[PDB]
Amino acid sequence: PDPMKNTCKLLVVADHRFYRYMGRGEESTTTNYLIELIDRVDDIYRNTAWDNAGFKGYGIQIEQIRILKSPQEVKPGEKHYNMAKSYPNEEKDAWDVKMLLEQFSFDIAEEASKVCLAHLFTYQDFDMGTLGLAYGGSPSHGGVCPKAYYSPVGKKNIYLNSGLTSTKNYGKTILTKEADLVTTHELGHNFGAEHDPDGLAECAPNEDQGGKYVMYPIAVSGDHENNKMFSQCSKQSIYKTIESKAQECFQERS
Ligand SMILES: CC(C)C[C@H](CC(=O)NO)C(=O)N[C@H](C(=O)N[C@@H](C)C(=O)NCCN)C(C)(C)C
Ligand SMILES: [Zn+2]
């Protein structure tokens, strides 16, 4: 473990929806929420022994918080992740999640190329209880350290070191304990973890064995012991990544 290359620095972005509905139209309220959430997620990462030995101390820290106070004005037929309307269906509260992650990665491309990860924090009710999305750890590429993807539609390179979290689900603000689990799961995909499968009991335990781990495909609730922790399956996947990636874009912990 290299102490000079053990931290994935983040570009955290709060859109106009997050600023209005979570930050009560205030910059201090917005940033405090985000700073505390990332610090709690960091506690899970930093304390995880990726090899079940001394390969721990790897975490995340915020490099910058971009605060989008108002919607992004767009020309007719032009789209932006911070625009007032949802896409592709303006009648819906939320964007289609896959299209929003692709749009955010397109719009943030220049900033994303200079950071370990970029994460969008929004407040929109994705269809069917979806809480977030991320690149990396998809059974498709991406995750930690900018990886270029030439977008034939966008006509430029976008980077796949991105993910997103919404703190709205089913018409209300999710609990902070639930929000921590969403961001951990999304960043888990970025770090290279795939979902925990039912077929491996060690990786998806019963409620009497501590419950499911953070990478389970169905959202926890956050009341069981395992809920906040990475399974041995996630650890094996991430351990392979960390080795191959820390030297590429990780920095010293501040
Ligand atoms: C933090 C969670 C695990 C993220 C996953 C989606 C995913 O794999 N993101 O990487 C999610 O939103 N899962 C939803 C989920 O379990 N949502 C819960 C909160 C829910 O609303 N369940 C409703 C039951 N009909 C799905 C897509 C399975 C509906
Ligand atoms: Zn997932």
Curated annotation (Swiss-Prot):
Which Cys residues form disulphide pairs? 8-116, 145-249, 203-233
Q: What upregulates this protein?
A: In arthritis-affected cartilage.
Q: In what tissue types does this protein appear? A: Ubiquitously expressed. Expressed at highest levels in adult heart, placenta, skeletal muscle, pancreas, spleen, thymus, prostate, testes, ovary and small intestine, and in fetal brain, lung, liver and kidney. Expressed in natural killer cells (at protein level).
* Glycosylation sites noted in the Swiss-Prot or TrEMBL record: 47, 232
Subcellular localization: Cell membrane
PTM info: The precursor is cleaved by a furin endopeptidase.
The Peptidase M12B domain extends over: 6-254
- Active site: residue positions: 186
Q: Which residues bind Zn(2+)?
A: 185, 189, 195
In its UniProt record, what illness is this protein linked to? Inflammatory skin and bowel disease, neonatal, 1: A disorder characterized by inflammatory features with neonatal onset, involving the skin, hair, and gut. The skin lesions involve perioral and perianal erythema, psoriasiform erythroderma, with flares of erythema, scaling, and widespread pustules. Gastrointestinal symptoms include malabsorptive diarrhea that is exacerbated by intercurrent gastrointestinal infections. The hair is short or broken, and the eyelashes and eyebrows are wiry and disorganized.
The domain comment in this protein's record states:
Must be membrane anchored to cleave the different substrates. The cytoplasmic domain is not required for the this activity. Only the catalytic domain is essential to shed TNF and p75 TNFR. The conserved cysteine present in the cysteine-switch motif binds the catalytic zinc ion, thus inhibiting the enzyme. The dissociation of the cysteine from the zinc ion upon the activation-peptide release activates the enzyme.
Function text: Transmembrane metalloprotease which mediates the ectodomain shedding of a myriad of transmembrane proteins including adhesion proteins, growth factor precursors and cytokines important for inflammation and immunity. Cleaves the membrane-bound precursor of TNF-alpha to its mature soluble form. Responsible for the proteolytical release of soluble JAM3 from endothelial cells surface.
**Subunit note:** Interacts with MAD2L1, MAPK14 and MUC1. Interacts with iRhom1/RHBDF1 and iRhom2/RHBDF2. Interacts with FRMD8 via its interaction with iRhom1/RHBDF1 and iRhom2/RHBDF2. Interacts with TSPAN8.
Identify this protein by name: Disintegrin and metalloproteinase domain-containing protein 17
From what organism does this protein derive? Homo sapiens (Human)
What taxonomic ancestry is recorded? Eukaryota, Metazoa, Chordata, Craniata, Vertebrata
* Residue span relative to the full protein: 218 to 474 of 824
